[PDB]
Amino acid sequence: KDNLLGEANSFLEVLEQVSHLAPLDKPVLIIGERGTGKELIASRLHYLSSRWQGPFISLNCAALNENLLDSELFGHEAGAFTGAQKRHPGRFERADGGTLFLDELATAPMMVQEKLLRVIEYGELERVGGSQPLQVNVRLVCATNADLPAMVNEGTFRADLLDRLAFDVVQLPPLRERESDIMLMAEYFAIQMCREIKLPLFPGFTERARETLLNYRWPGNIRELKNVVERSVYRHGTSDYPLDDIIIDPFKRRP
Amino acid sequence: DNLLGEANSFLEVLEQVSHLAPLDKPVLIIGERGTGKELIASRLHYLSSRWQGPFISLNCAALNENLLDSELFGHEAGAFTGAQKRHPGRFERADGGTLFLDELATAPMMVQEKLLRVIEYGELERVGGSQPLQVNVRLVCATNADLPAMVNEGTFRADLLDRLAFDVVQLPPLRERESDIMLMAEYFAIQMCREIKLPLFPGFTERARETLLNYRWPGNIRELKNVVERSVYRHGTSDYPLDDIIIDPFKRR
Amino acid sequence: EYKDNLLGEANSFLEVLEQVSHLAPLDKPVLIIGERGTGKELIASRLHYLSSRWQGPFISLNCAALNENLLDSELFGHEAGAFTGAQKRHPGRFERADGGTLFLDELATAPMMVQEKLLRVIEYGELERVGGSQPLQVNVRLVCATNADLPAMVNEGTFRADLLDRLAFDVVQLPPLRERESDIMLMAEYFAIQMCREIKLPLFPGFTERARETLLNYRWPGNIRELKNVVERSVYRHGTSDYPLDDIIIDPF
Amino acid sequence: AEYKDNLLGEANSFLEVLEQVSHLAPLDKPVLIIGERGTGKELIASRLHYLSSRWQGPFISLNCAALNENLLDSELFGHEAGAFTGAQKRHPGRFERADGGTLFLDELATAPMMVQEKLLRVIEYGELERVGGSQPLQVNVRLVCATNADLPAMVNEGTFRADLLDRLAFDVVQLPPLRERESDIMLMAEYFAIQMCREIKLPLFPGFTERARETLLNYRWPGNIRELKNVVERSVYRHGTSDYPLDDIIIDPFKRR
Amino acid sequence: MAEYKDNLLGEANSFLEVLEQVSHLAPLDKPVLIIGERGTGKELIASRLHYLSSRWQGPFISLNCAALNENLLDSELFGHEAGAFTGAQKRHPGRFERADGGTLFLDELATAPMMVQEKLLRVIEYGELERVGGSQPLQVNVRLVCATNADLPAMVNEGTFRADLLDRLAFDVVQLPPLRERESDIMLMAEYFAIQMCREIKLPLFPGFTERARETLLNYRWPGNIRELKNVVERSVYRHGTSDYPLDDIIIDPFKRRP
Amino acid sequence: KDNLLGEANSFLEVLEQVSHLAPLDKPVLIIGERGTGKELIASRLHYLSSRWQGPFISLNCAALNENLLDSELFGHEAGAFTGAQKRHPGRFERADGGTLFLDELATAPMMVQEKLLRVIEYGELERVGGSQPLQVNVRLVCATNADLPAMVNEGTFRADLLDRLAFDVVQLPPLRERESDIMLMAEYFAIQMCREIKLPLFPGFTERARETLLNYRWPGNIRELKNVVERSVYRHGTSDYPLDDIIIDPFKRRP
Amino acid sequence: MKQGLQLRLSLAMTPQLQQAIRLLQLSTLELQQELQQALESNPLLE
Ligand SMILES: Nc1ncnc2c1ncn2[C@@H]1O[C@H](COP(=O)(O)OP(=O)(O)O)[C@@H](O)[C@H]1O
Ligand SMILES: Nc1ncnc2c1ncn2[C@@H]1O[C@H](COP(=O)(O)OP(=O)(O)O)[C@@H](O)[C@H]1O
Ligand SMILES: Nc1ncnc2c1ncn2[C@@H]1O[C@H](COP(=O)(O)OP(=O)(O)O)[C@@H](O)[C@H]1O
Ligand SMILES: Nc1ncnc2c1ncn2[C@@H]1O[C@H](COP(=O)(O)OP(=O)(O)O)[C@@H](O)[C@H]1O
Ligand SMILES: Nc1ncnc2c1ncn2[C@@H]1O[C@H](COP(=O)(O)OP(=O)(O)O)[C@@H](O)[C@H]1O
Ligand SMILES: [Mg+2]
Ligand SMILES: [Mg+2]
Ligand SMILES: [Mg+2]
Ligand SMILES: [Mg+2]
């Protein structure tokens, strides 16, 4: 499919579950830490999914405000629209039969929440008069980094609607918990950045870098992975000289 | 199966609802979190003489355009630019038949007073066409009980709702329903297997059935459907009986 | 003739109605200390029908909780200025009724700012438009009704006591359900007749003294409307002119 | 031009105040009213507006307190184009009201210290506090004030800054307290009683019962703008004694019988 | 050029030296910053600077933060160019655009939005700003004027004042001698104000003031240093009349209820 | 290129770090104290980047309008509409490669935070009524007088808000920290300030005052040093005046 | 709430209505009479 970061037993099982869900057009949930890219994984699995070649929706959550699905997802394609009349494309109508991914869906308001709840209850929220229904055939996807478990417990979203929006919630475990893909990512990023930073060679994570990583809590995980990647890009040293002090923390004050 | 089997008490309530369906009286309805009080309404509407008439059910208080309550009856376009006003409206769409409300829960106190007054007196007038209100054919309200109003008083303007005592319908819990719950689950499973094009029903351990029965069913049959979906996807095979049923997709391993 | 709606056998109700007739012949301000259900909007109709100018349009129906922006717009508007919700000149204005009179309800909800604007209009009708010079006045009497103990509200300084004084050329206490008890059975009979005719029931097949005692024991926190629509639900429970309603449930709650 | 209003004000101090107003008539500086709510503060204000106006002189008796909205008072500061939902349309507004006149404020405390200081920057200078070409309109405008709040109390609130209270103040008029005047109270009371007996077209004036007159004098009536007239209409409700003279004073309108 | 000060409020104690320094700063093009009691010579100082505008044609433009519209005055802050906010039409000059090269007669209005403070700091960084919706800004010039009444350092310490505010502000401090402090021309400026009051009131001649009057004047701090004294004097022009007025001090505190 | 030189070992280190980062178009921020010439530093860097001859125009977060927020980074179509106007490029298009620094970044709202999180993508710009996104990736940089670690401690700065920055934070020495070129920096500041003052050349400059000034917090390090210098220059206003007992302590009352 | 000139906002007679209203702008007695003669159609119009 695509070049992938992480082939661990957990990562491999994730790939297997992705294959299982790929036929499953029923909406599901892939949970994980941000700065990893589970959305890209969803895109690859969608290429493997029912829509082997189909549409795709990015749909960052807080990209629409005071803009209903009717404003953007449904659109104003027909005549007699607001202002002077013309054609206007709509997302949720545009990408039927493809992929419908919701980015940072945990970042959500109550009103859009009530909208999407009915959209799920009816297949799509539809437009205008209450006599008009709709359904969307795109592969519905969504993800964020928040444990909604308490958000619904706090009522930030409708708990029943939360239950409705998916059919199988899956959570990506911490890469820091893995801490084995540490070396694999280090090497892959070393090659990629040697191609990028145009270095003579990859310095290689010397003993101190490995020890620090072993001690590192790595809160950002894949986010912290790219963070350490940039950090070592700062701490290049020499292409020959293996990087023992590879990490570079911006917050710290040297000397 | 695709219809509302319903428990015995639920069956009696269903008979009462199918009877009240011919009664086109304005109503306010209450169903559980995942009970699905809408399908019974559709069955009643078919049983109602309003079966032939339009039955536009409220679109979850959707907020398209700025017409809002004038969305109930508005204009399409000025003749000079676009099309004729063409008398299209929301309160008009449910014409000759039922009229169902949805997401009545979300409203604040002011719009609550507005709805109470509309119940007291309703008129429909639009820049585009429109037609007189005070008919509200086979009117019925629903989804208000999701967010109670004036439960300890206050909240929304439900003092008039206390005054406005048109009949209402409760919603027993799925755990309290005691219907053919396993049968409904099996029906859903068969429907999914057809949808999934599955080889067959792999089966279910009666021990697994009893263990899954250890659940409040907070989403009622909706919770049942979600748990069944998760359990089957975990099974992912038609080979052996489902000794596992999904408690919650939120977990760790 | 105003239909003598809810003709109150209560003597205090009769005195209140006599005062209502006297003041309605007058064209002077007045207050009504009454509750929703306790004469909900009925006295407004009494004033409109017995208005000092019967031809003078008394729209009444001011039990209107409108948002601060919404209420202020309901008072005043601007042509081709601001006012995103409406368009161009705002005919929507308290001057909508000239020749008749002007009333208020849910008046406890009036902000001190809105209350001040109202008192200013009461003393002198001017500046009733968001746009332009509004010295013009539409002649109309003043009346209102809210259920709050507005003496405490002013003791709380909740709104302008200026209107509270100026408008209150007569504050009329109005009867809740607990006030009228002798007329309770008669009003129940009147409502039952109205329902049977409306429900096409020939009549109530029979009334049990137990039924009357139970209904009287069942209080009416909403003085009329709660009792009225409770009777609606109870008749729906009975539904048969042949079947007497001895214990027809008033309300689901 | 316009005569000051007729008002039964037999209080000799009230007469002195009227004389003070007479002195202020040609004068062009701010005036305050420290009159009570229900002390005819607006009434004396109108008398003043007529007298000092003295040549078809415009007045303005408006309360931004009635202007319930912030954007409302913002519009009261004129805008030429893009004014709220409006776009490129004229709106003279309150500026025209004060054009060739003065400003009379009834209980101006409700104004925010932001609004207060807006008015402060307007007062001494006068150039147009409005979105307009160079906003240079320092119109020939005076001002006058009326509120029941206390100056130290306002300082505690701080809603009136130092220069606010000061460049606000050039004259002050505390209306005679409703508790202060006793004889003039019954005097204006009889005046209004006659006014009612006339306007109501009642063929007979009931007059005034001695017990009723004594009760009215004992009645605090700290509000007496028309709360006196209100109690007058209260007894007029107990009409039918037009030939008679029987006491009927409505103390608690909420209370019945 | 050299113009007669339209006012003659001078307090010889230090406002003489203050005026000397102000004249020194008058040719300068750096930020003009002032501080002191409102109703006390400070807006008068603003007049002083505005006349003290080197050469002429400098637009003595004054905009007061309290005299504005929250969430809306921004359209007039850096300018307006496009439709849907300035009523379409043309590039609508904002308060800043209304004064290019002219005086930024700001006073420390201490408006609630520190956002306003930053927006001004955005204007006051390098002489550059943009009308609303303009894809191209405009780097401009204008005289800059500030006047205050409160301890900006305290509020910044209290976090109430944007440190950046006083930072982009305050080319230097300009405080004022209080009426409890200046006390130089009490009788002299009193005579000047009384002369104006007589020229208005058309009384026959100067009524005169007793020594007890000046005694109470010394006893008074005069909270509105330049103004509250003028209030006393103006009220003195009222009440009793003619030349007989002399003793019995004067009418200083209108707020003071009559004895 | 014609800005104040720090003339410090830390200042030299910062200059070298900027020189190293000159080709790097990766996202960045100015940590430390804005209003101490972080603006000038970023500007001179924009002059000397890999795209030295490129269109660079910085921007401040707190500038635009909440309603016009969508019109901030971009432009709306509004063809036959109320705000009818031509296809407008807008900011994220208006820069297109150069340095548009994220100033006032500490002064942002959570809604603007969502906007930036959308901007975390290299272009892919969806406008109002737009058909297809456009990828406008540019040399990216910001400024932060605040401690984003403490900000995420308060949480108002999202973890993604921190993630947007793609550079390890270079920090400059505060007033107490730097205190290196204080005499020389004061000398240059006096040169400029007296060139403004047009007074005769200062015959008096006593370094004992400079020493006592070193015994001061100088919270406005870059600004207030020269500020008090020029303020004392104006207050003294004398050429033959030694740097003795002269100080701009506006908080202090004169005696 | 408050109002603003910028918002999602929801006309002017064109061609046919222009000549129509011009018939009103033209005098009905004679100026419109020439056009009415020029009609020469809509036989269902006596
Ligand atoms: N398996 C992987 N292979 C390559 N890159 C990856 C992998 N997982 C994550 N990434 C990197 O992590 C980033 C995650 O981006 P994205 O999915 O947009 O985050 P979010 O979903 O929080 O917006 C991607 O830019 C990608 O380069
Ligand atoms: N007795 C029943 N007969 C048929 N379908 C049912 C029954 N109970 C539950 N359902 C299903 O449960 C789902 C609940 O969906 P929804 O209407 O959103 O629930 P609610 O009305 O509680 O919000 C419905 O789609 C419906 O198909
Ligand atoms: N001389 C008078 N005789 C009778 N009534 C008077 C007289 N002067 C004033 N009033 C009454 O006092 C009422 C309140 O006046 P006023 O106190 O000026 O109002 P405001 O509260 O605006 O100051 C008016 O309605 C008026 O009828
Ligand atoms: N030294 C003075 N001599 C005479 N009059 C003065 C003097 N100082 C102030 N005034 C009076 O104060 C008024 C100016 O008020 P001012 O202090 O400028 O208001 P603000 O404080 O709002 O700028 C003038 O009318 C003037 O008569
Ligand atoms: N290293 C330095 N040497 C001499 N003068 C300096 C130095 N740094 C700053 N300055 C002076 O102080 C001022 C600092 O402002 P600036 O650095 O532009 O603020 P910012 O960069 O934070 O916007 C400049 O105008 C400059 O004249
Ligand atoms: Mg993403
Ligand atoms: Mg539902
Ligand atoms: Mg008044
Ligand atoms: Mg001033």
Author numbering:
A (entry chain 2), F (entry chain 3): 5 to 259
B (entry chain 1): 6 to 258
C (entry chain 6): 3 to 255
D (entry chain 5): 2 to 258
E (entry chain 4): 1 to 259
G (entry chain M): 1 to 10, 13 to 48
Task: Give the published text.
Bacteria use sigma (σ) factors to recruit RNA polymerase (RNAP) to promoter regions of genes that need to be transcribed, with 60% bacteria containing at least one specialized σ factor, σ54, responsible for transcribing many stress response genes. The σ54-mediated transcription initiation requires specific AAA+ proteins (ATPases Associated with diverse cellular Activities) known as bacterial enhancer-binding proteins (bEBPs). DNA looping enables bEBP hexamers to engage and actively remodel the RNAP-σ54-DNA closed complex to convert it into an open complex. In this work we capture intermediate states of bEBPs in facilitating DNA opening and partial unfolding of σ54, and therefore link the ATPase activity to DNA opening and σ54 remodeling, which eventually lead to transcription activation.
